[PDB]
Amino acid sequence: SWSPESWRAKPIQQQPEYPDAAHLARVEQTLAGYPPLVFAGEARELRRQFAEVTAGRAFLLQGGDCAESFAEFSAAKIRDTFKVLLQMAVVMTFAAGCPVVKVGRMAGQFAKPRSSGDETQNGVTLPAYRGDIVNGIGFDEKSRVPDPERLLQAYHQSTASLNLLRAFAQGGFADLHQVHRWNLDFIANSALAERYQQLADRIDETLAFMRACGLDSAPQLRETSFFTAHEALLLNYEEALTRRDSLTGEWYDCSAHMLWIGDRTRQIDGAHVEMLRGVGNPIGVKVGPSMDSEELIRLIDILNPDNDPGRLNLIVRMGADKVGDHLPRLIQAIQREGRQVLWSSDPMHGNTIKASSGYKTRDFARVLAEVRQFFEVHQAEGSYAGGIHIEMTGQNVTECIGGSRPITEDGLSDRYHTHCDPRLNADQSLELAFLIAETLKQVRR
Amino acid sequence: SWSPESWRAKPIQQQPEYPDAAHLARVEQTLAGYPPLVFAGEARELRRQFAEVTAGRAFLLQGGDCAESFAEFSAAKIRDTFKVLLQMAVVMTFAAGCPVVKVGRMAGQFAKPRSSGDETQNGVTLPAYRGDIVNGIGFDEKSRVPDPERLLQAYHQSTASLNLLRAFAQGGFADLHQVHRWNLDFIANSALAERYQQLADRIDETLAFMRACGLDSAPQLRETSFFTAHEALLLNYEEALTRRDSLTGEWYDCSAHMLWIGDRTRQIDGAHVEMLRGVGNPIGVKVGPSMDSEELIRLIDILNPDNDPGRLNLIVRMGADKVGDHLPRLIQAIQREGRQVLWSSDPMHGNTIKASSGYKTRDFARVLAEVRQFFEVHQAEGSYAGGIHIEMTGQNVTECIGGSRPITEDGLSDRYHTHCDPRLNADQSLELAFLIAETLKQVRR
Amino acid sequence: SWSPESWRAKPIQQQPEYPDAAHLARVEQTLAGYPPLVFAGEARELRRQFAEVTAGRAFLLQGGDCAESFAEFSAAKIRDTFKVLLQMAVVMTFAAGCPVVKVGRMAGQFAKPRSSGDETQNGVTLPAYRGDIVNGIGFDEKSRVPDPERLLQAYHQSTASLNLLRAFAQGGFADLHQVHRWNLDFIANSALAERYQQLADRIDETLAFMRACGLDSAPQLRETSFFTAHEALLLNYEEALTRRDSLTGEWYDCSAHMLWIGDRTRQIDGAHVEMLRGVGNPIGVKVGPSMDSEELIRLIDILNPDNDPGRLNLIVRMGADKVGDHLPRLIQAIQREGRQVLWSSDPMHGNTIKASSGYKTRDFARVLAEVRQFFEVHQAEGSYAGGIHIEMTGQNVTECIGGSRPITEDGLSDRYHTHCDPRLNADQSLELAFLIAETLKQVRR
Amino acid sequence: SWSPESWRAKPIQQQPEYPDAAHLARVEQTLAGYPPLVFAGEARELRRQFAEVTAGRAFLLQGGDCAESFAEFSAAKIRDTFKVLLQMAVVMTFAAGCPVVKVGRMAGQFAKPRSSGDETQNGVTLPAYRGDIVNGIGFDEKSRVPDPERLLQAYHQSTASLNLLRAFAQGGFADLHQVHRWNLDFIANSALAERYQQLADRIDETLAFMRACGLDSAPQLRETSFFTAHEALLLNYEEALTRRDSLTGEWYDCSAHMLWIGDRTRQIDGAHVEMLRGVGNPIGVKVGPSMDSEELIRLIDILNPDNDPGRLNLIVRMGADKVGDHLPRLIQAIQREGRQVLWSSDPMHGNTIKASSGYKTRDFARVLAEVRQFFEVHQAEGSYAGGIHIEMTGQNVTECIGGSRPITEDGLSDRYHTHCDPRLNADQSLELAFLIAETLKQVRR
Ligand SMILES: N[C@@H](Cc1c[nH]c2ccccc12)C(=O)O
Ligand SMILES: N[C@@H](Cc1c[nH]c2ccccc12)C(=O)O
Ligand SMILES: N[C@@H](Cc1c[nH]c2ccccc12)C(=O)O
Ligand SMILES: N[C@@H](Cc1c[nH]c2ccccc12)C(=O)O
Ligand SMILES: [Cl-]
Ligand SMILES: [Cl-]
Ligand SMILES: [Cl-]
Ligand SMILES: [Cl-]
Ligand SMILES: [Cl-]
Ligand SMILES: [Cl-]
Ligand SMILES: [Cl-]
Ligand SMILES: [Cl-]
Ligand SMILES: [Co+2]
Ligand SMILES: [Co+2]
Ligand SMILES: [Co+2]
Ligand SMILES: [Co+2]
């Protein structure tokens, strides 16, 4: 049997050590009384859309932050990342004639899993930084001791962020008439920028035609659905925000529409699998090179016992060198056992190089290579390449190498070569969108 | 005061001499008891659409037969002419983003005005052929004596023709998914054929996008309004088919949605002006080189005393040599007197050359030149070039010279160089549509 | 193998004896060259709607003339019968929340099957009157000899009638704002008239609500689909109007959307079954008391070999005394053999009493009793009561007894007590519609 | 000239005395960097809807808290108040056929104007409670000293509240299929409860009809616009949340869609008028008995110099005894000077009785009397009664006397008889909605 607190009886990885259990429990009770971020009916609607993807009738775009931070809590940052997501979505929707399910890694993507539980600099060892929802990035004792009050700050940043995202999605910002406005000003003077401009002009002509034909009325042209997701890592936060549906009695984790389990926390007997087992949300699991086909099926039996086609997103992150060797055997097992899953590529988390110094690099060419091979593997196996899962930014930076132009090495990006990972910029994201749109069009041809 | 028979008190041109007045009256009474071709509410809807054109928010496409004939009463002929009209309309709608009001010279365009009331061949003089609704094309006494029973045959051909047209317009034939099917098979292996194909592909992509966005539902994508028109020439026919609106009591000529007065029958004190004065239909007048600005205004005072913007279509047919010299003074008068009119170009009837032999030629280059100059004159005067009025066919023939390829001289086309006039073929009609679409796009830019 | 003329090799009932075979063949060739009444795509759309009925998601309303006549060829008669059909449809649609498929016995219901091939009055025996498409109602030699030219007159009346019906259905007459206007002025000063008025007011409030909510735009509120049907009896007419679909090559009888075989002409080895076997239209068969379950299945095997759910309408006409005894065994056979059929009640043709004099009476109470029992039988068997098939008129007459008020005995109705049968009037039709709407609401509850 | 800080140069009423100016300024800067609650485009959309009301084509429903509190920050409270607003809106929309603009006094209605700047209990005098955004309700020094950190707590409660409201409005909670679910369980066993049930059933029948007709698709049936409003009282909060529109450069107060000036702070030379003068939001002004016609016009000149019809809501709160004597002269002045305003009734704030003890009572019968007279006055003057502005709750309490049943005297309601004012409950709100719906229907008849 399941409860929102049943995870606490299981073995668990990646959790902080709080210094005062009672203080933690007080903050958890405060949070438990605060309004949810999402309505259960919305999570059901995302499941319905996931089922369209799983059936090959739509495509899942999931994108946003590596890890959101309290020091970057602005409307401009939120807006500009949303613009990139809209630009990618409209490229794929128009060029491929394919509905796109838009899910942001936003409004709650704070907690970060770490390779090591501690960090050492020149003879001093402190607890690892686990994201702003747990502790601070500064290498000092006060910063690194987990502080339960950070749960509430994360909640407050999430409600402000999602309120604004809902306002943009429904209130006119995402109206198709605004297609040119979604292109960030630093996408310019290039073949890619021209390509988007031309596509946007084709959309203008489409809308003018639909107006001349007597439509243009349709609310679908003026708004779009937008959903949120994050890794369900800090289960104290997730439990506090887990709530029963008023109508059905069924539990939903209402911190976000979609929750996923990370590659380091997907132990079948573990806490994270136990938490998501019993919520009604659509959910995801990160599937890295260590996953074999036997243990994948066992995980699916726990996380989707009814084999519902909108329930489960398998987010494959193998690396450009391993996707061809590892993915086919997993697909074959799913096909053999008749399982309904939404397959996505995370082409980023398997393609990070960490130097001895700790400095992280991601080569955009390896990113693109993994995406190309992911579609190739699905094509060979007769299965459906259903989505893309990326870390990106609307900021005018270059964090991944191998792009058209060289990396920028701004201090604001230092976080994204050490504690976090390198994100795609708008140019890279747009190039990826065009690649996917061409690939989808050929699949649907 | 007005009645459906008040025209009979006026001087009249272009009427046949029937041999038995009582026989004529019996056929008129039979017809008066037959159902109308159109519903008054439909004529009102066309007036509403004419008002959109007059205001510069739409464009009027009027096209079809020089004169319909009893010997060419087929579904294939009707369908193929309708295809050309759809192809022209969709080109202008998509390329210019402009609603197109589609009106066919069909389902009643039988009566023909003639330069001479008789015809002489080798010492024998007979009454002129005035169209199948009056008499027969054969040069012999029996054929040429007006036969009132031909009124009923024309009525029956009209109901069959319009029934089929309504079925095509509403029943799926004009669904935008059928855009490729409207291109006749002899439009091929040319730059123009490729141009339409490419536009049709853009429409497919538009519809696929609208489906991906969640529309594609809209009935407007599956059907289109279609209206009929003919010259109100044989007033016996028009009177019999003139009926009172059930709801409003007001009279409509229900032989067609739109009726026009020909260039030879527009005498301000004459029968034809008197007939149309008192019906509620949208109406047209042919305006040739003989029209001065004073008498135009006097005509408008009679035909549109309330200055209703959906009432009156001025159909300008000057010839490519005269449109620049004659049209500006007419527009200036309309602007000065604040009159609301829909200006159309008939670029055909002012560009016919009749040799001493009687053989008629129309140079497509002169046709295009008059259209170009018509738009030029409106541009210079600040008025709106609101429509095109053409004679065309879906048959695989070439009747007008100066086209990409030479004229065909098929016997079926002999009618159209003697009694009737040369029609545009599908290639010419499509070339014209692209010219207009480019011109409209530049007007709306 | 099948052709439009393959029926001519089979045994045939109910056909006229034409005096000149060559003359008949000339008229058939003339007709074969005239435009069709319907487009094959439309017949396909009606099949799609029949499939909705068969699945229990809609209801079939079929109504119109016993037999159309040349002497009653008016717009008013056509309009007023259409009003009754609209009133019945809107009652069932609004009160039961059930889509209604509207099919008129109109624009071609001329040929009549007869009990006897001749008629005798005071020592003189003449061929039976078989409807105006064959011969005349007058009891004299000239009238009764079949005249092939009547095929063309029937065609011409049909195109005029259907043109007008299409105009009403699509052009505004059937806009839901016109709901009060469909009530004929002689429905007044009664509980039934008040009941319709109140329902019409509820529709007004619905439309005002939808306008206030931001809809009211929808073309579905302004137009409705309308289809035609008649008994395929005079196969010469049907063959001439049978045409190949341009796109698919498949044959459709394009005289009407739906054709049915009469109770006297449904011999499994006969001409009428052979004709309809090979056309693509939705079709019907009249099923009277003489039908057993074995021969029904054999008929279905011929007429619907692929068991398509939109193909076949079984039109049950048993009489109020026999429907309970005869229908259950037929339903059981269809259920046992897994056949997909649309079951309708014709509650009129099994409830006619013919006196020794020849005078026909129909008791409206028996009509209602058969309808009630038809729904009862379906309820008991777990099958779907899918439609109603009636003979009705918009004329201010009373032809069936047992109505609220007594029969009128107008001369115009004498036809409908001798050669034709008594029709329901508007009051009776409305009462029936309310009965059906209540019954459907209880089925869907 | 105007800036977001120009109010600071003007004389000002109702402001707190903060103990540390620098601390206040630090919190203001923090807030100034946080995301806005609303998008400027949304405020423009509300102006567009206000213009519909002003023109007599819609009705404004504004309702919610007297003053929101930190101790009542729940999803249930937010949801249940939203249910009441939906129930009122759907009653007026369906029964009157009138679009309703829905605006909640929610997500920011914290600051309260007070009659006295201090409060004395048994020889101790402390600063007045001014709402949770300023200080605490407890009568003690620590509670009553203004604390600038409360600005941030109010912001955080507002983003959580509006996020949830947006989720309900767009995400399915406000789908018209949910009409029964908006009725709170304690509305039952009464004529009023039956009346709503019956109306909800009529809506179900409407939706079933629209489904049967082929609609039911429309996104307008599934979602609704919802906007927020509060009194712009604490100008420090408003200034921090005032932001420039990205596209137009123009300033909007992005704390809420609509802001109003209270009856005690509407001095024409004062700070509150100065603040709202220069923002682009739709705005309101409370108009009490002290307002004369000369000073109203002068206020309108400042707050709506362009006489835009969507800009200004005059919220009339006179008391049931004074509305008839005071309102007509104000309307006459507006009509004489050609001003475009949206007239609303606040029938609550002029109908409070404060005993010597301080205990506040509001008689629901006086509330209804003022509303009735407000509509009467507009009817007499030829102007439009455009909206209602109420304080209400979804809690199962009775705070206003004169209701069907007696007041409850729950401790949770003690706030609403001392510091705040008595709110309407769901029964009272529904009764009011029916009164208004009947009145609107008669206006539109
Ligand atoms: N009904 C729309 C679109 C449309 C349908 N079929 C068409 C054919 C040609 C042009 C446009 C259309 C219109 O008339 O504009
Ligand atoms: N609402 C549609 C169309 C749409 C609106 N805005 C968008 C932005 C991007 C992509 C599509 C859209 C959809 O989500 O598909
Ligand atoms: N969207 C429509 C209909 C609607 C949906 N939900 C509502 C709730 C109440 C009133 C109306 C509605 C409107 O706002 O009018
Ligand atoms: N077009 C819809 C609604 C409709 C329009 N006119 C009608 C007349 C009767 C019944 C329904 C309708 C339908 O056929 O259902
Ligand atoms: Cl909750
Ligand atoms: Cl690579
Ligand atoms: Cl008529
Ligand atoms: Cl030329
Ligand atoms: Cl054909
Ligand atoms: Cl009986
Ligand atoms: Cl901002
Ligand atoms: Cl009172
Ligand atoms: Co990362
Ligand atoms: Co001509
Ligand atoms: Co009969
Ligand atoms: Co108050």
UniProtKB/TrEMBL annotation, chains A, B, C, D:
One of its GO terms (molecular function) is 3-deoxy-7-phosphoheptulonate synthase activity. Keywords: Cadmium, Cobalt, Manganese, Transferase. Its cofactor is Mn(2+); Co(2+); Cd(2+). Mn(2+) binds at residues 66, 349, 391, 421. InterPro entries: Aldolase_TIM, DAHP_synth_2. Disulfide bonds join 66-420. Binds 1 divalent cation per subunit. The enzyme is active with manganese, cobalt or cadmium ions. Phosphoenolpyruvate binds at residues 105, 263-264, 286, 317. It holds the Pfam family DAHP_synth_2. Its EC number is 2.5.1.54. GO terms for biological process: aromatic amino acid family biosynthetic process; phenazine biosynthetic process. Belongs to the class-II DAHP synthase family. This is Phospho-2-dehydro-3-deoxyheptonate aldolase. It comes from Pseudomonas aeruginosa (strain ATCC 15692 / DSM 22644 / CIP 104116 / JCM 14847 / LMG 12228 / 1C / PRS 101 / PAO1).
